Design a protein around this ligand. Structure first.
Ligand SMILES: Nc1nc2c(ncn2[C@@H]2O[C@H](COP(=O)(O)OP(=O)(O)O)[C@@H](O)[C@H]2O)c(=O)[nH]1
Length: 382
């Protein structure tokens, strides 16, 4: 996932600000913060505030960019394995001042704010609600970068995740989009992608994967030249990110030969399958049919551009997104062109879509059953 080439003649759309909450919540934000880029004067375009109980792992987290990040610790809350949300609630409150004071300065120019939290835990999970109130009462443009625990995480944990999802989904109107991350999915992906890899490389993989996923789209929307008036530039992007509800990012890279306008069903399926198999969490057609906003950017070389971006294509795409999200306000099928392209990736046609205003995924539903299975069986034994 190297962007050295693009970032050079490219540029970001929004200046994100990640508010870390808990071990995992800070692991991601920190990962997003420690991102060097070839952009114009700003190796580290992202800033973050790591808010978590004083632990040995948090006291371990390494930061590359000094000054763009600030660790905030909470005394007398070395919870640990306890994993009690309410506790994490008091902690954030008892230091509410010492925190916001750091948010009022570290984010004096952040177009958006990603409340990165690891659902299921106790610290982050608990403060996740008090953190939203803070950024809300102080009029900010924030979103929710949450992660869905896996089954092996045991009962208790799952109960915590579910507890907040419900609270969130019912107050989603009070803030931006919710970039849900399915740890179960990513975990199951890392096994396929790298079958030989060891379990000690997971987190790194995911964090570095979630960071690039979020960063890649932010870079694409404002690093290429449009082929027409239909745009999905920084301005439009900012919209999809401020719309309440879950957000699903999709990506698909194909070759010019593979892509056939005469026989679209061939690749359309892939795009339709790649759109269902989100980058961070799986989503079915049913859930997409209730999306408020959509967008699909196509990036390719200057030569394959004029040839590919014909009348038929543009429509075939307009129809694709159409059947996928019939109730979307507007379907900006904005095709872009990249001049500074490598002849190696010359015959490549990349896709980038962003579906917002989506309902809760099927995963959260499963996490409700896995908790039910346990509780029920725990009594079927009595
Ligand atoms: N993607 C990712 N998820 C994590 C990481 N650390 C923890 N998590 C997830 O977040 C959940 C809560 O763990 P953690 O954040 O350490 O608990 P907390 O510190 O009390 O908020 C776990 O069940 C994990 O699934 C991480 O580094 N990366």
């Amino acid at each position: 996932g190297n962007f050295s080439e693009i970032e050079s003649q490219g540029n970001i759309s929004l200046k994100f600000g990640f508010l870390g909450l808990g071990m995992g919540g800070c692991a991601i934000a920190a990962e997003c913060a420690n991102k060097e880029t070839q952009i114009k004067n700003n190796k580290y375009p992202y800033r973050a505030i790591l808010v978590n109980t004083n632990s040995q792992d948090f006291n371990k987290i390494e930061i590359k960019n000094t000054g763009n990040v600030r660790k905030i610790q909470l005394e007398g809350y070395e919870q640990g394995a306890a994993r009690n949300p309410q506790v994490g609630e008091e902690a954030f409150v008892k230091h509410e001042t010492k925190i916001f004071e750091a948010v009022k300065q570290e984010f004096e120019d952040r177009d958006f704010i990603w409340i990165t939290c690891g659902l299921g835990g106790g610290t982050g999970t608990g403060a996740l609600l008090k953190a939203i109130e803070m950024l809300y009462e102080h009029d900010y443009n924030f979103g929710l970068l949450l992660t869905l625990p896996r089954d092996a995480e045991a009962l208790k944990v799952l109960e915590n995740a579910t507890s907040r999802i419900r609270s969130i989904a019912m107050n989603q109107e009070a803030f931006g989009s919710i970039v849900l991350i399915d740890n179960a999915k990513l975990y199951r992906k890392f096994e396929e992608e790298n079958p030989s890899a060891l379990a000690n490389e997971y987190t790194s993989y995911s964090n570095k994967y979630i960071a690039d996923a979020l960063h890649e789209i932010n870079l694409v929307t404002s690093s290429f030249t449009p082929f027409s008036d239909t745009h999905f530039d920084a301005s439009e992007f900012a919209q999809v990110i401020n719309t309440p509800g879950v957000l699903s990012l999709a990506k698909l890279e194909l070759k010019s030969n593979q892509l056939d306008t005469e026989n679209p069903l061939g690749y359309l399926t892939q795009l339709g399958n790649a759109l269902e198999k989100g980058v961070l969490y799986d989503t079915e057609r049913e859930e997409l049919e209730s999306a408020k906003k959509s967008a699909l950017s196509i990036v390719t070389s200057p030569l394959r551009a004029g040839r590919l971006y014909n009348f038929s294509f543009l429509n075939q795409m307009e129809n694709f997104l159409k059947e996928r999200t019939p109730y979307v306000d507007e379907r900006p099928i904005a095709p872009y062109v990249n001049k500074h392209t490598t002849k190696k990736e010359e015959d490549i046609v990349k896709f980038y879509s962003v579906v917002a205003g989506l309902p809760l995924p099927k995963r959260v539903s499963d996490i409700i059953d896995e908790i039910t299975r346990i509780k029920e069986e725990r009594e079927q034994a009595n």
